[PDB]
Design a protein around this ligand. Structure first.
Ligand SMILES: Nc1ncnc2c1ncn2[C@@H]1O[C@H](COP(=O)(O)OP(=O)(O)O)[C@@H](O)[C@H]1O
Lengths: 58, 359, 34, 188
């Protein structure tokens, strides 16, 4: 388990502020310092289970 | 018989409609973009399917659209789909549900009805005919080379029924109902009386034919709110704004206009003049008959003691409007609910009359 | 309705038609330029 | 009274008996003899209001309905049931099937106008197994508002044809009304 600790190195995670979801499949979002991005979701979540005003690991 | 042939025809049309290489091409169109892309705002534009954009972080790149969707679909100063590479325009966007259209855009029914306003008529036919009419049956004006009654004005004391009318129409109307108050037309930020007016009018023009309604247009003058600036050399413009927007250049189109003021002595003539506001309607304060319809209407939808006589109340107050009468109707309700009594009595209305009117 | 009848079927022809060569031919204005 | 009923191919005369005895069979509470008169009602209740009889017994055959006068005449209550309405479209299509060169001459020689005969037309020549004209000479006759100008020109257009060239000729009598008809006949 402590061997995959290199994982921490993989990269980082971007919290984000969802502006709202739409059609075509891709959540519309404004991260934080930067601004709005419309971007795909994780496969493990719906588009529908995604509401407006909520944090999510990008 | 041909109806069947007609129906299946309609059906076959549905199939071909639904019936709408390409997959790759579509994926090519997906592949072309980037996952994920980047929001960014329009600035200038050029026939080179590229202009300079605008960003919060404010990189402004020159970039093409990924072209099937269009540049002319959009205007300068508008957020567009950009890659993260060059911020390449990847396509248009949809000006998300702003917070203007919402507020100003009464969707659900307005309640009431054109057979709820006891004691009116000529006032009614005047408004309806001038506005509601040309909206429903607009086929006459198309022959008499006339148009519709531009704007309309409602005035009179406090409780004549001006808001009812705005409420009645909306009840059986069919056009976007923009309910903007002038009092709100007075914010605490310089040069903001002309944004609100533009946004309300701009929002009205977009939703296509609609009813812009301004209740208490007087409040735009007969009032000087602390938190403001300029004091009154600002409100004036805001008037000027209203006067200009509610009026000339461009070509307003189907924005009908409804103003609800109590005192018409404090309106700039520029707003009253015709063109801007033609039909000028008054709301008299009942009398002895209208009130009967008003009283009967307000006490007819409840367990009103069939003993008492709405008359006593009608001949009671001196010049009570269509409100005071309603308050008495309601007063009994609380009286009724007070001493726990399904049906009200005499005093209940009495206490009401003396509880509301007098006090 | 007869005229109206002719109207419907006529329109259905293209509808029927359009689907045909649609099947047959199955980006570059831009995807090239892109 | 079943005897005078034995010959059932009448265009009309079989009607009243097939209404009376059938209503005599309808108030009698029966679904047998009643239908036999419904095929053979070439009028049952046309002017008079129809009971449960017409609605049920017409259509029962109506969907069953080269040709059987039983079927043919059953709907000669129906197409008139649609003509008493003067509006519009249903048993005409029933008639388009019928390939009877009597009825199409025989049905509406009178009555309807405007839009109404305009859509009778496309049914007249085109739709039946054969091609027909008669109404467009026949009901055509009276053509009050210009016999025929009003409706026939609505007919003279459409069917990008020319058969309606006389139709305008016949009514259009003014040189200059005909000059327009002339071009109208010319435009075909
Ligand atoms: N004659 C009447 N018929 C129906 N409702 C009335 C009548 N008189 C008063 N009301 C009620 O009282 C309220 C008075 O509002 P309004 O007429 O707009 O007065 P103001 O213009 O002073 O605001 C309305 O909402 C209406 O429902």
């Amino acid at each position: 388990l402590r061997e995959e600790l290199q994982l921490l190195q993989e990269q980082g995670s971007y919290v984000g502020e969802v502006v709202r979801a739409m059609d075509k499949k891709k959540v519309l979002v404004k991260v934080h310092p930067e601004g709005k991005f419309v971007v795909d979701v994780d496969k493990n979540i719906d588009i529908n289970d995604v509401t407006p005003n909520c944090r999510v690991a990008l | 018989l041909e109806r069947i042939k007609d129906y299946l025809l309609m059906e076959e049309e549905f199939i071909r409609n639904q019936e709408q290489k390409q997959e790759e091409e579509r994926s090519k169109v997906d592949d072309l973009r980037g996952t994920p892309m980047s929001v960014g705002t329009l600035e200038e534009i050029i026939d080179d399917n590229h202009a300079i954009v605008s960003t919060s972080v404010g990189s402004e790149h020159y970039v093409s659209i990924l072209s099937f969707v269009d540049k002319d679909l959009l205007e300068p100063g508008c957020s567009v789909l950009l890659n993260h590479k060059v911020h390449a325009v990847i396509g248009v966007l949809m000006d998300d549900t702003d917070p203007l259209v919402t507020v100003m855009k009464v969707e659900k029914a307005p309640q009431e009805t054109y057979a709820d306003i006891g004691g009116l008529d000529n006032q009614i036919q005047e408004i309806k005919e001038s506005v509601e009419l040309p909206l429903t049956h607009p086929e006459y004006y198309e022959e008499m080379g006339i148009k519709p009654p531009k704007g309309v004005i409602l005035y009179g004391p406090p409780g004549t029924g001006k808001t009812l009318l705005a409420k009645a129409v909306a009840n059986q109307t069919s056009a976007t109902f923009l309910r903007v108050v002038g009092s709100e037309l007075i914010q605490k930020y310089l040069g903001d009386g002309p944004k609100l007016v533009r946004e309300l009018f701009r929002v009205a023009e977009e939703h296509a034919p609609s009813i812009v309604f301004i209740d208490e247009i007087d409040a735009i003058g007969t009032k000087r709110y602390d938190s403001n600036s300029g004091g009154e050399r600002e409100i004036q413009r805001t008037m000027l704004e209203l006067l200009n927007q509610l009026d000339g250049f461009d070509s307003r189109g189907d924005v009908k206009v409804i103003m609800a003021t109590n005192r018409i002595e404090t309106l700039d003539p520029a707003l009253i003049r015709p063109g801007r506001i033609d039909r000028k309607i008054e709301f008299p304060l009942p009398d002895e008959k209208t009130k009967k319809r008003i009283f009967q209407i307000h006490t007819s939808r409840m367990t009103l003691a069939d003993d008492v006589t709405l008359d006593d109340l009608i001949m009671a107050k001196d010049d009570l409007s269509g409100a005071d009468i309603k308050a008495i109707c309601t007063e009994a309700g609380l009286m009724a609910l007070r001493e726990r009594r399904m049906k009200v009595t005499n005093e209940d209305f009495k206490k009401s009359k003396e509880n509301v009117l007098y006090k | 309705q007869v005229e109206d009848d002719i109207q419907q079927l006529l329109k259905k022809i293209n509808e029927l038609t359009g689907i045909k060569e649609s099947d047959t031919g199955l980006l570059a204005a831009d995807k090239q330029t892109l | 009274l079943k005897e005078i009923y034995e010959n059932m191919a009448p265009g009309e005369n079989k009607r009243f008996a097939a209404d009376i005895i059938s209503v005599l069979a309808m108030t009698m509470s029966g679904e047998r003899e009643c239908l036999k008169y419904r095929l053979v009602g070439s009028q049952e209740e046309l002017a008079s209001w129809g009971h449960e009889y017409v609605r049920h017994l017409a259509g029962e055959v109506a969907k069953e309905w080269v040709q059987r006068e039983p079927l043919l005449t059953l709907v000669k209550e129906i197409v008139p049931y649609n003509m008493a309405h003067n509006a519009e479209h249903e048993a005409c299509d029933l008639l388009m099937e019928i390939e009877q060169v009597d009825m199409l001459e025989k049905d509406i020689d009178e009555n309807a106008y405007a839009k109404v005969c305009l859509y009778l037309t496309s049914c007249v020549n085109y739709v039946p197994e054969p091609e027909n004209s008669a109404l467009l000479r026949c009901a055509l006759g009276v053509f009050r508002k210009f016999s025929r100008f009003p409706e026939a020109l609505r007919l003279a257009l459409m069917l990008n044809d020319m058969e309606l060239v006389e139709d305008i000729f016949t009514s259009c009598k003014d040189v200059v009304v005909q000059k327009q008809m002339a071009f109208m006949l010319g435009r075909h």
